[PDB]
Amino acid sequence: GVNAVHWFRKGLRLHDNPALKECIQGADTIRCVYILDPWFAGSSNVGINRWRFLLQCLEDLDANLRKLNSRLFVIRGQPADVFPRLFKEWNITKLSIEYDSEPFGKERDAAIKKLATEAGVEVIVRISHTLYDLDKIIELNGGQPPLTYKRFQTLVSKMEPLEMPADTITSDVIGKCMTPLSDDHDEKYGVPSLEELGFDTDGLSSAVWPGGETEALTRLERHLERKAWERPRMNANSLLASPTGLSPYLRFGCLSCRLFYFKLTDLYKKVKKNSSPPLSLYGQLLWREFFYTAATNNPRFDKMEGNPICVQIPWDKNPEALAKWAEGRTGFPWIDAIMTQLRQEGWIHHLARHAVACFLTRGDLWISWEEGMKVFEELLLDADWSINAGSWMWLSCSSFFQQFFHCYCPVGFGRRTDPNGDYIRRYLPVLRGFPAKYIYDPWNAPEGIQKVAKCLIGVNYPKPMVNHAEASRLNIERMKQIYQQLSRYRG
Ligand SMILES: COc1ccc(-n2nc3c(c2NC(=O)c2ccc(C(=O)c4ccccc4)cc2)CS(=O)(=O)C3)cc1
């Protein structure tokens, strides 16, 4: 008969999955696969929190596929190596994927499409990771992605309204389509543990961001309910991970960005009684869309050299200073607490991202945004290659049409956000004995207060790695020199 395979990569969900929906129709068998390769050289920068989140996403998909008398098939290796084997072993004639706009993904999928055509396999590709067809955005702009956010808002406003999200895969949708299964299915296709991937899980606590579609849909309800109770304002509690947080689920595809969009539009129309909401309503959704669009045709989006849209800034190379930043031992408790939360949990507030990005690049250390991006790629759960690269370029003053002239204070920003320093004490236990007057600048604490706090600066917690007033004055001057001769730094 017609034997079909749906290939999960992103879109780790059964709701709003047009590719899986189309693949099942007219099919006699269906197998959903995820191709996992934790040893891939190109994935050497993936942190353990990302691996854990993904594995929890796969367990949730497997559990939800159980409800449809199916299972997830987890397969080890590289798609180019695995798919020809599967095409023959399973006699596959249909393969479905959610479209991937990112350059590496487009390249991989082009190769797989060639293997499928060679094997007599029809390839079904449907767009569902983004709100729009990004290629249509670019065509509407004249063939180039809009290089500014409000130009992007202009084009998007002129587009056709979004079509309804695809129906969720139910028993009545599967119909006669079945999944051939064996009693030993877990031995060959089961979802592995972190330990089974060779990871020592020593030092791991319960995940602050549990993966999966079930979690995402539960959080979506809470998120809308809280919104039922304009751009929000950050306070101290905003720094903590929220049970209403959706951002990692949108990144992995646990939550459909189109479903989220429609639920937001639905809620707005109920409270504000009109169908033309402020683009404010969608929060980061269009920033998300903006960076996917800017990156899709730029294979060097994550680089400075050879990247046509990036300002060629002469950053310093300082591996020791970069390591202090990445490992949260800069000696600035505000910076270190943020980098510690990021490493421990996999999410930090957007304004905390601005703070540590400024400190590393244009503000204090004058280290390339490429190096910050690599660290964030390792640890951050909610930012794809396209969004990470674009965000680091924009925030480091590396885009020609976005400048920041105010340098974040690595003491005052934290003190102004959380005056008592509860955030510091939560993530930097060595500093817990310091009173609020010194918690953001413990080097200013007299020797007696340090001894009482059982924390000698330079012994138990490092001294501040730079003099911020001097470093920022020099770096503000350097950035002013660059933008005074901006065209000279065009590649
Ligand atoms: C520093 O490292 C990172 C920082 C942020 C992220 N990040 N993660 C996600 C998203 C983003 N990024 C942005 O939303 C974004 C928005 C505005 C700008 C900006 O230039 C600007 C202009 C005017 C005023 C204020 C700001 C830059 C970035 C959206 S998402 O895909 O949903 C999940 C990743 C790494």
274 and 169, same structural domain?
Answer: yes
Ligand 1 neighbourhood includes 388 CB (under 6 angstroms):
yes
Q: Is 328 left (phi over 0), alpha (psi -120 to 50) or beta?
A: left
361 and 336, same structural domain?
Answer: yes
Ligand 1 neighbourhood includes 357 CB (under 6 angstroms):
yes
325, exposed or middle or buried, with CB in 10 Å at 0-12, 13-18, 19+?
buried
**Is the dihedral angle over the CA atoms 422, 426, 428, 430 positive or is it negative?**
positive
264 and 237, same structural domain?
Answer: yes
Q: How many domains does the chain have?
A: 3
Q: Which of 417, 458, 419 has the alpha carbon at shortest distance from 435?
A: 419
383 labeled binding residue: yes
Protein residue whose Cα sits closest to atom 9 of ligand 1: 383
H runs (alpha helix) in 29-119: 48-66, 79-90, 103-118
Q: How far is CA 207 from CA 56, 178, 190, in A?
A: 10, 34, 21
Contact 167, 15 (CB under 8 A): no
Helix or strand holding residue 471 (H, E): helix 468-484
309, exposed or middle or buried, with CB in 10 Å at 0-12, 13-18, 19+?
buried
At 405, which amino acid appears?
F
CA angle, 42 then 43 then 44, to 5°: 95
**What tokens appear for 67 in the block?**
């409800």
393 CA to middle of ligand 1, Å?
10
Ligand 1 atom closest to the CA of 373, numbered from 1: 2
Ligand 1 neighbourhood includes 391 CB (under 6 angstroms):
yes
Three-state DSSP at 169 gives coil
**376-404 CB burial, b ≥16 within 10 A, e <16:** bbbbbbbbbbbbbbbbbbbbbbbbbeeee
Distance of CA 469 to the CA centre of its chain: 33
Round to whole Å and give the CA distance between 256 and 127. 11
Q: At what angle do helices 333-345 and 350-358 cross, to 10 degrees?
A: 120
Strand order in the sheet with 3-8: 72-76, 29-36, 3-8, 94-98, 122-126
Residue 180 forms part of a structural domain: no
89, exposed or middle or buried, with CB in 10 Å at 0-12, 13-18, 19+?
exposed
CA angle, 173 then 176 then 178, to 5°: 95
**39-77 CB burial, b ≥16 within 10 A, e <16:** eeeeeeeebbbbbbbbbbbbbbbbebbeebebbbbbbee
136 and 113, same structural domain?
Answer: no
350 labeled binding residue: yes
Contact 164, 302 (CB under 8 A): no
372 and 242, same structural domain?
Answer: no
475 and 354, same structural domain?
Answer: yes
Residue 153 forms part of a structural domain: yes
Torsion of CA 346, 351, 355, 361, to 10 degrees: 80
Ligand 1 neighbourhood includes 383 CB (under 6 angstroms):
yes
Q: How far is CA 307 from CA 313, 386, 387, in A?
A: 12, 13, 16
Ligand 1 neighbourhood includes 434 CB (under 6 angstroms):
no
H runs (alpha helix) in 199-349: 213-228, 247-252, 257-272, 285-295, 319-326, 333-345
Q: What is the resolution of this structure in A?
A: 1.9
185 labeled binding residue: no
Ligand 1 atom closest to the CA of 353, numbered from 1: 1
Q: What are phi and psi of 292, to 5 degrees?
A: -60, -40
Q: Which of 246, 255, 212 has the alpha carbon at shortest distance from 227?
A: 246
Ligand 1 neighbourhood includes 468 CB (under 6 angstroms):
no
Q: What domain range is 341 assigned to?
A: 299-491
Domain's final residue, options 128, 144, 165: 128
Domain's final residue, options 277, 298, 319: 298
Round to whole Å and give the CA distance between 389 and 373. 6
